[PDB]
Structures are given as C-alpha cells and as structure tokens.
Amino acid sequence: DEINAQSVWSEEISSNYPLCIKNLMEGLKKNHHLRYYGRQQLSLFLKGIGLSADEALKFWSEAFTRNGNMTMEKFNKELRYSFRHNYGLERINYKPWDCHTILSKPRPGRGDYHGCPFRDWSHERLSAELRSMKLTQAQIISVLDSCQKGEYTIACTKVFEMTHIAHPNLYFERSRQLQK
Ligand code: SF4
C-alpha cells in the first residue's frame, strides 16, 4: 500500500500521472473542489491505482475542507455519500475510465478539469506545461503536431516517451514500473 491519502500528493507518485490526472489534481488543490465529471475521472483513477475506500475518504475530505473551503459538516452533508458510492460503500462496479471514455464525455467549460488536456488546452498552455516537464521545443513541436492531427492518445504517449491500449491507469502502471 505505497498508495494512500498522503502519498498520492507526493512528487514521487504524482510524477507517474498523465496530464489529465495532473490537471484534475491541480484544479483540486487550487479550488479545494471538483465538479461532477472531474470527481469521477479522478476518483475512479485513484481507485484503479489501488487507493482504498478508507484512504479515498481521507483524501477527498481533506482536499475539500482544506484552507477552510467548507466545514466537514458540509463535506459530510453534500459529498461523502458520492465518494462512498464510487467504491460501493452503499452495487455497480464503477471501472476506471479509459482514454476513449474520457474523450466521449462532454467537453469541459470554465471551472472544469475533466477530459483530455491534449485536446482541451491551447498550444500556449501545453507548451509551458511541457517545458515544466523538461521537454525541448523539438519535442513540444512533435507533440503539438499530434494534437493538431487530433491524435491525443499519440500526443500523450509521446510525452510518456520523452519523460521516461489507451488508458490513464495504464499510463500510471507503466510509469511507476520504470521508477521501481
Ligand atoms: S490520453 Fe488518455 S490519458 Fe493521456 S491525457 Fe489524454 S486522456 Fe489523459
């Protein structure tokens, strides 16, 4: 259980996240909240990587109440049930979303962090984030070229390739295979 409420905010573990998951964790940390599609993408991913039901509630409760965003009553009242549901602590088997599933969901608008950055971000914002992951302009160009072509899974696999079938949990599994 190297995965838990605390370790998922570590750099070690979070360096294995593809960009969608990064984006959802970034949004979570800034706004101490996520909207419905984000809470599902993120929570099922974390389930997928072996985060326990207990640790998920720790994770989500801490995240949402952080820096006094909402009381723990509010969290308990408005959101605890939802997350419990996602692990079945109330009997559907909610599998982690795949790359095709994620893209199929309604495009994200303002306040939304779900979906796929390779499709959803501007070329400006992608550049920065790729620079921040120590890619060169040669590398960035090749990635944006895939984005232009609407080949987001390829764009993403490139970034996996230049920082080391189509599933964020597979992105994670493979990335943390290389760490250990
Ligand atoms: S490809 Fe699948 S995994 Fe890689 S970023 Fe887009 S959505 Fe997230």
What total of structural domains would you count in the chain?
1
**Residue minimizing CA distance to atom 2 of ligand 1:** 99
Q: How far apart are CA 62 and CA 10, in angstroms?
A: 15
Q: First-to-last CA distance in the chain?
A: 14
Q: How far apart are CA 180 and CA 171, in angstroms?
A: 15
Residue closest to 115 by CA, chosen among 127, 104, 128, 124? 104
Report the b/e string of 103-114 with b at 16+ CB within 10 A: beeeebeeebbb
Q: Which atom of ligand 1 is nearest to the CA of 21?
A: 8
**Token couple for 83:** 């997350």
Q: Which atom of ligand 1 is nearest to the CA of 153?
A: 1
Q: Which of 171, 173, 174 to mutate to test the pocket of ligand 1 (most atoms within 8 A of CB)?
A: 171
Determination technique used: X-ray
**Token couple for 74:** 């509010």
Cα three-residue angle 59-64-65, rounded to 5 degrees: 105
Q: How far apart are CA 48 and CA 98, in angstroms?
A: 11
Count other Cβ atoms within 10 Å, centred on residue 143.
23
Give the distance from CA 169 to its chain's centroid.
10
CB-based contacts of 178, cutoff 8 Å, min separation 6? 164
Asked whether the beta carbons of 102 and 115 are under 8 A apart, the reply is yes
Q: Which of 46, 118, 164, 169 to mutate to test the pocket of ligand 1 (most atoms within 8 A of CB)?
A: 118
Give the distance from CA 4 to its chain's centroid.
15
Residue located via tokens 């549901």: 85
Q: Give me the domain span that covers residue 44.
A: 1-180
CB-based contacts of 55, cutoff 8 Å, min separation 6? 3, 4, 5
The type of residue at 1 is: D
Q: What residues line ligand 1, using a CB cutoff of 6 Å?
A: 18-20, 99, 102, 116-118, 152-153, 156, 166, 168, 171
Q: For CA atoms 128, 151, 17, 116, give the dihedral sign.
A: positive
- Region of 134 (left: φ > 0; alpha: ψ -120 to 50; beta: rest) is left
Resolution number, Å: 1.8
Count other Cβ atoms within 10 Å, centred on residue 142.
16
